[PDB]
Amino acid sequence: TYTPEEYLKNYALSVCIAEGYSAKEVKNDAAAAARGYTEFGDYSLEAHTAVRALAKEFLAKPYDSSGEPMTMAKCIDLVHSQELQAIIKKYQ
Amino acid sequence: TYTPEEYLKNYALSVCIAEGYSAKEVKNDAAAAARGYTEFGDYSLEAHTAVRALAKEFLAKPYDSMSGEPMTMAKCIDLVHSQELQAIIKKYQ
């Protein structure tokens, strides 16, 4: 199993990747993963929407890359961030 | 921001996402991220190639899905939390 916190972090990564790339292949796949972490998770739908909002905040940050958008790095930083931890502790 | 084990975990997820999806957009971006996470001050070249082998094994597993999507994202998440990845980290410590 994952813990509730780990599920909400998996959800964070999954929605971040689904939001941050345009390829339908990936949006659809990561979206289905995010739905699964929400259904097996314990956090409220509100906690989930605040995580999604935070993911968009991270994706909106301009990273210096290589010429790549560095989405992958933004989503990894999101999962590791003090900001996501604050959301977890607001709701826990 | 990251210990060397957290970097190797970031590498693992990046290479898994680069390997796991067809789309060049995501492939190029995730591969570029994996290069950034590649360091050899605590994890050898061989530690990395074992991480990549393990990612490809995770991607090879069939996952059930009510959506009919392959669940690549879930496979890669499972990789990063796997005992097999921990064993790599311990071995090459």
Numbering used by the authors:
A (entry chain A): 27 to 91, 93 to 119
B (entry chain B): 27 to 119
What is the paper's account of this structure, in its own sentences?
Some Gram-negative bacteria target their competitors by exploiting the type VI secretion system to extrude toxic effector proteins. To prevent self-harm, these bacteria also produce highly specific immunity proteins that neutralize these antagonistic effectors. In S. marcescens, the resistance-associated proteins Rap1a and Rap2a neutralize Ssp1 and Ssp2, respectively.
The structure was determined at 1.9 Å resolution with four molecules, arranged as two dimers, in the asymmetric unit. These four molecules, sub­units A–B and C–D, are similar overall, with r.m.s.d.s between superimposed Cα atoms ranging from 0.6 Å (subunits A and B, residues Thr27–Gln123) to 0.7 Å (subunits C, residues 27–127, and D, residues 27–126). The ASA of a Rap2a subunit averages at approximately 6110 Å2; the range is from 6140 Å2 for subunit C to 6090 Å2 for subunit D. Dimer formation occludes an area that is approximately 20% of the ASA, which is indicative of a stable association. A disulfide bond between Cys42 and Cys102 links α1 to α4 and interactions of other side-chain groups on these elements of secondary structure help to create the helical bundle fold and in particular to align α2. Together, α1, α2, the α2–α3 loop and α4 form the dimer interface, giving rise to a twofold NCS axis, and a combination of hydrogen-bonding, salt-bridge and van der Waals interactions serve to stabilize the association. The side chains of Leu39, Ile43, Tyr47, Val52, Met99 and Ile103 are involved in van der Waals interactions with the partner subunit to stabilize the dimer.
